[PDB]
C-alpha cells in the first residue's frame, strides 16, 4: 500500500518522517524535527514489502538515516525496522538501532536500542 | 546440564562470570572484572531451563546484574539473554540490554544493546 505509506508521519517525540513509497519497494524521504528547519533535515532511504500478504498481516519495512547533512554531522546512523498497519488508525510500529562511530575500546557501547510508533496526526 | 553451567566463565572483554546452577532453575553468582578485586564484584541472579531437550538444542537462560555494590553505584543494570551449548567447546551465547536511570527527557536513549560470548578458558 504505497498509497498507505506515502505521506507525512509523526512519532511520539515530535520528529517528522516524510516518505514516498516506490512501486518497486523503495522508500525515499526526509527526517526532520518539529521546527522543520533545513539544518535539522536528513536524508533517508529504505525498502518495504511491495506485495504484502492478504491475510490481515502488516507490511514489513525498514529505513536508515545517517546523521549528517550539509550543516551538522553526529557521526552516527539509525535504522528503524517494523511494519505498517493500515486502517482507521494507520500507523508504523518500529524498533530502532542507533550506532555511533566509536574507538575499539568503546565499541561495546556503540549501539542504543528503542522503539517508535508513527501516526498520521501529531501526538 | 546443571553440571555444565556451574563454574567460571570468561567473555571477550575479559570479564569473569562465576555462576552456580540450582536444581530448580535458579542462577546465582557474581560478575567481576579480570582483576577480581572486591570493588569490581557485583551480585547476579537469573533463571534457566532446568529440563532442556537432550537432542542437541541449547539450554535457554538469562540473568541480571544491577551495577551497585558496597563500593560504587553506576545507576544502571544489565540483563543477558541467551543459551548454553555444551560439548568439547562449551559456550554461552548471549545478547544483552544495559539500561541507565535517566530523566524523562533522556529516556529515549536509556538503553544500550550488545552481545557477549562466554567460554570456559580466557580469550
Amino acid at each position: 500500500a504505497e498509497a498507505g505509506i506515502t505521506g507525512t508521519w509523526y512519532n511520539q517525540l515530535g520528529s517528522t518522517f516524510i516518505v514516498t513509497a516506490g512501486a518497486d519497494g523503495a522508500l525515499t524521504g526526509t527526517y526532520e524535527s518539529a521546527v522543520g528547519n533545513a539544518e535539522s533535515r536528513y536524508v533517508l532511504t529504505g525498502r518495504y514489502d511491495s506485495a504484502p500478504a492478504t491475510d490481515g498481516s502488516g507490511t514489513a519495512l525498514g529505513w536508515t538515516v545517517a546523521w549528517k547533512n550539509n550543516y551538522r554531522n553526529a557521526h552516527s546512523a539509525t535504522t528503524w525496522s517494523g511494519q505498517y498497519v493500515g486502517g482507521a488508525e494507520a500507523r508504523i510500529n518500529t524498533q530502532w538501532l542507533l550506532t555511533s562511530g566509536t574507538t575499539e575500546a568503546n565499541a561495546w557501547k556503540s549501539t542504543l536500542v528503542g522503539h517508535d510508533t508513527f501516526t498520521k496526526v501529531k501526538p | 546440564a546443571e553440571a555444565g553451567i556451574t563454574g567460571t566463565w570468561y567473555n571477550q572483554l575479559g570479564s569473569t562470570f562465576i555462576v552456580t546452577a540450582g536444581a530448580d532453575g535458579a542462577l546465582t553468582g557474581t560478575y567481576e572484572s579480570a582483576v577480581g578485586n572486591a570493588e569490581s564484584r557485583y551480585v547476579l541472579t537469573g533463571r534457566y531451563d532446568s529440563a532442556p531437550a537432550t537432542d542437541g538444542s541449547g539450554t535457554a537462560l538469562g540473568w541480571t546484574v544491577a551495577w551497585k555494590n558496597n563500593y560504587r553505584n553506576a545507576h544502571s543494570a544489565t540483563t543477558w539473554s541467551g543459551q548454553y551449548v555444551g560439548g568439547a567447546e562449551a559456550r554461552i551465547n548471549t545478547q544483552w540490554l544495559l539500561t541507565s536511570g535517566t530523566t524523562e527527557a533522556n529516556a529515549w536513549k536509556s538503553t544500550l544493546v550488545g552481545h557477549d560470548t562466554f567460554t570456559k578458558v580466557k580469550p
Binding site: 517525540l13 515530535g14 520528529s15 524535527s33 518539529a34 521546527v35 528547519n37 539544518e39 535539522s40 536528513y42 546523521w67 551538522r72 553526529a74 552516527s76 539509525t78 542507533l98 | 527527557a105 529515549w108 536513549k109
Partner: peptide, 12 residues
C-alpha cells in the same frame, strides 16, 4: 536533547 534524533535544533 543534543542529538538530531530527539529533535536537536539547538547548539550544544
Amino acid at each position: 536533547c543534543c542529538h538530531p534524533q530527539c529533535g536537536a535544533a539547538y547548539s550544544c
